[PDB]
Ligand binder design. Structure first.
Ligand SMILES: C[N+](C)(C)CCOP(=O)(O)O
Ligand SMILES: C[N+](C)(C)CCOP(=O)(O)O
Ligand SMILES: C[N+](C)(C)CCOP(=O)(O)O
Length: 178
């Protein structure tokens, strides 16, 4: 089966492949499978993931051509620590701007919920705490509510994505030319 870390045909991205990626992480309380389909017309080059909470043992897929999707994952920090998997993925686009994707899969659903977001930043900006705070608090993230959400991104692009509500999370995003 396709694995986290791979770049696949973007038409092959879907819940089945992400479920498999999520299952392959085994028995961990909070974990996420992330798939982002690049149909933007331009190549993305990975910069970094800012992990606010949690970690990954997967290399952030380096080059993602138009027509390809990346597969990735993250998991809570090891041991009983009551924290989840929360972070921002940042890819450079060939126009000199940055594609940023927020994911948040909190430890405690009594206080918090799943959220995600997608935004293009002007210039080359590495993912960091400031970007996490902007995307989570101020830039209208979407709830992981087991439903799809669309939004135009500017820069000739639009996004359509889905995230479920539970702590074994899947996040599937398609970035297409608007
Ligand atoms: C809930 N949060 C997203 C604001 C902070 C991080 O959550 P957690 O990793 O402590 O659960
Ligand atoms: C602060 N806390 C993480 C122990 C519980 C949640 O409080 P709040 O951040 O929902 O106000
Ligand atoms: C994410 N948010 C800051 C826009 C809404 C509040 O969500 P949460 O932190 O209470 O789960």
């Amino acid at each position: 089966a396709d694995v986290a870390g791979a770049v696949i045909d973007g038409a092959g991205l879907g819940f089945d492949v992400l479920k498999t990626v999520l299952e392959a992480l085994g028995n961990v309380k909070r974990k996420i499978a992330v798939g982002i389909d690049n149909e933007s017309g331009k190549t993305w080059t990975a910069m970094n993931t800012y992990f606010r909470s949690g970690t990954s043992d997967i290399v952030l897929p380096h080059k993602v051509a138009h027509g390809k999707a990346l597969l990735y994952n993250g998991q809570k920090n090891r041991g009983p620590v009551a924290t989840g998997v929360v972070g921002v993925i940042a890819y450079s686009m060939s126009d000199g701007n940055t594609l940023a994707v927020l994911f948040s899969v909190p430890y405690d659903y009594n206080w918090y919920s799943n959220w995600w977001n997608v935004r293009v930043y002007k210039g080359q900006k590495r993912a960091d705490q400031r970007m996490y705070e902007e995307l989570y608090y101020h830039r209208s993230p979407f709830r992981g509510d087991n439903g799809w959400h669309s939004r135009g991104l500017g820069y000739g692009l639009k996004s359509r994505g889905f995230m479920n509500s539970s702590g074994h999370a899947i996040l599937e995003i398609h970035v297409t030319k608007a």
